[PDB]
């Protein structure tokens, strides 16, 4: 999409059965627990156009997904059936959508709203994982503030009532460091700059104590064969393996299948709890063959993943399943 993302946009959040305007001063910040509709009006190549992006946060509920479908059909009809329509799940945003925020990162908070609970309040201590893709599109995703949530490949922002830290993994890019700084501007906090390996005591204390975290030779590498994830299933009646594009999200791990994560110097074979034995056997055979055409093969089970695996994902919830 050659359009530059600087057209007029309106953003609404699904709240119950309605779409509700988002504060225009916070465009670019979204709750991961919610669904949104973005109406983007632009002009490119001498012609006007409109796109509706329907963005589904990773923790948004089925009720909100269904509500969004009604709301977008309504909007579509209101506009006379003119917009291009695009459905996007968190982590799978196209470059064009990432460009709508003036070069700022997409910031994804924990929580959101629901019919029952209303708007959740922010935690007093917060941790965000800041990751950029190869193209430079940057996401700052809120996670639980524990030492184990860190990964060497990315930048992190840690905000507490009394302090703020910008932790920079050895593998973190300048886009990630910049994105972390933009997040800190939104949080209205001035950071202590912390490099991986020289953390001050206050940093670990703020996280509830020092602990091992998500690291490996490849996670620590700054240069970047960037890791590829594959879904392995025999559900269609024969065994096949296909790639999972976009940012690597925990939801991409199919609990009824086997997943291959190739980090180049290692291939993980992740076994879903409801996957059949044959899917593991064939995934192991396929992985060995991939490797041999041109390296550890590490088997991991759902719910028992090692930090070296979990570090490649953008956010991880220990109680996801």
Mark 172-191 with x for binding to Ca ion (rule: CB under 5 A) and - for no binding.
--------------------
Check residue 311 and report its DSSP letter: T
Cα angle value 236/237/240 (rounded, 5°): 65
When asked if residue 112 is in the footprint of Ca ion (CB under 5 A), the reply is yes
Residue of the chain from 4, 243, 256, 265 that contacts Ca ion (CB under 5 A): 256
Does the annotation place 4 within a ligand binding site?
A: no
Q: Which of 252, 257, 262, 282 binds Ca ion (CB under 5 A)?
A: 257
Q: Which helix (H) or strand (E) holds 53?
A: strand 47-56
Residue 281 known to bind ligand: no
E strand or H helix at 180: helix 174-186
Residues numbered 131 to 170 that lie near Ca ion (CB under 5 A) are 153-154
Q: Would you say 196 is a known binding-site residue?
A: no
CB of 272 to Ca ion, least distance (A): 7
Measuring CA to CA, how many Å separate 3 from each of 70, 232, 289?
28, 37, 43
Strands of the sheet with 106-109, listed across from one edge: 29-31, 106-109, 138-143, 126-132, 155-159, 164-168, 192-195
Which of 97/132 has CB closer to Ca ion?
132
The two tokens of residue 12 are 């609404």
Residue with tokens 């490119």: 44
111 binds Ca ion (CB under 5 A): no
Q: Has 154 been labeled as part of a binding site?
A: yes
Measured from each CB, the residue nearest to Ca ion is: 112
The label of the residue with tokens 């002009």 reads: 43
Q: Which stretch binds Ca ion (CB under 5 A): 158-166, 221-229, 275-283, 289-297?
A: 275-283
Binding to Ca ion, residues 17-56 (CB under 5 A): 33-34
**Token pair in block for residue 4:** 């530059």
* Residue 76 is assigned to a ligand binding site: yes
**Exposure string over 68-83, b if 16+ CB within 10 A, otherwise e:** beebbeebeeeeeeeb
Q: With respect to Ca ion, which residue has the nearer C-beta, 49 or 246?
A: 246
Question: Which class for 257: exposed (0-12), middle (13-18), buried (19 or more C-beta within 10 A)?
Answer: buried
Q: Is 81 annotated as a binding residue?
A: yes
Chain breaks in the chain (C to N over 2.5 A) after: 224, 294
Closest CB to Ca ion among 208 and 217? 217
Q: Which is nearer to Ca ion, 282 or 305 (CB)?
A: 282
Q: What's the closest the beta carbon of residue 3 comes to Ca ion, in angstroms?
A: 27
Stretch that binds Ca ion, among 22-30, 66-74, 92-100, 249-257 (CB under 5 A): 249-257
Quote the tokens at residue 72. 């977008």
Note whether 315 and 154 are within 8 A (CB). no
Residue 105 touches Ca ion, criterion: CB under 5 A: no
C-beta of 67: minimal distance to Ca ion in Å?
A: 10
Closest CA to 258 of 268, 266, 248: 268
Binding site: residue ranges? 33-34, 64, 76, 81, 83, 113, 153-154, 176, 256-257, 279
Binding site for Ca(2+): residue ranges? 33-34, 64, 76, 81, 83, 113, 153-154, 176, 256-257, 279
List residues binding Ca ion (CB under 5 A): 33-34, 112, 114, 153-154, 233, 235, 256-257, 275
């Amino acid at each position: 999409m050659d359009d530059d993302g600087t057209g007029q946009k309106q953003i609404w959040r699904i709240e119950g059965s309605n779409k509700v305007p988002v504060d225009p001063a916070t465009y670019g910040q979204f709750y991961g627990g919610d669904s949104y509709i973005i109406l983007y009006n632009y002009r490119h190549g001498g012609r006007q156009g409109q796109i509706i992006y329907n963005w589904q946060g990773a923790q948004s509920t089925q009720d909100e997904v269904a509500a969004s479908a009604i709301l977008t059909a309504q909007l579509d009809e209101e506009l006379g059936g003119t917009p291009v329509q695009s459905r996007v799940v968190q982590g799978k945003e196209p470059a064009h959508l990432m460009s709508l925020f003036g070069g700022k990162p997409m910031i994804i908070y924990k929580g959101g709203t629901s019919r029952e609970g209303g708007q959740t309040a922010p935690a007093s201590t917060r941790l965000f994982q800041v990751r950029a893709n190869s193209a430079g599109a940057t996401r700052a995703v809120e996670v639980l503030p524990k030492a184990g949530a860190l990964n060497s490949n990315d930048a992190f922002v840690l905000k507490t009532p009394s302090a703020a830290y910008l932790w920079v993994g050895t593998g973190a890019s300048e886009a990630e460091k910049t994105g972390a700084q933009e997040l800190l501007r939104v949080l209205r906090a001035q950071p202590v700059q912390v490099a991986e390996g020289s953390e001050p005591d206050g940093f670990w204390e703020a996280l509830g104590g020092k602990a091992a975290y998500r690291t490996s030779p490849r996670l620590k590498d700054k240069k970047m064969h960037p890791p590829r994830l594959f879904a392995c299933s025999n559900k269609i009646g024969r065994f096949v393996i296909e790639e999972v594009p976009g940012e690597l999200m925990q939801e991409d791990l199919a609990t009824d299948d086997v997943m291959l994560l190739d980090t180049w110097d290692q291939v993980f074979v992740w076994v879903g709890k409801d996957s059949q034995e044959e899917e593991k056997t064939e995934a192991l055979t396929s992985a060995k063959r991939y490797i041999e055409t041109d390296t550890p093969i590490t088997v991991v089970k759902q719910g028992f993943e090692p930090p070296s695996f979990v570090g490649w994902f953008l956010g991880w919830d220990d109680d996801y399943w």
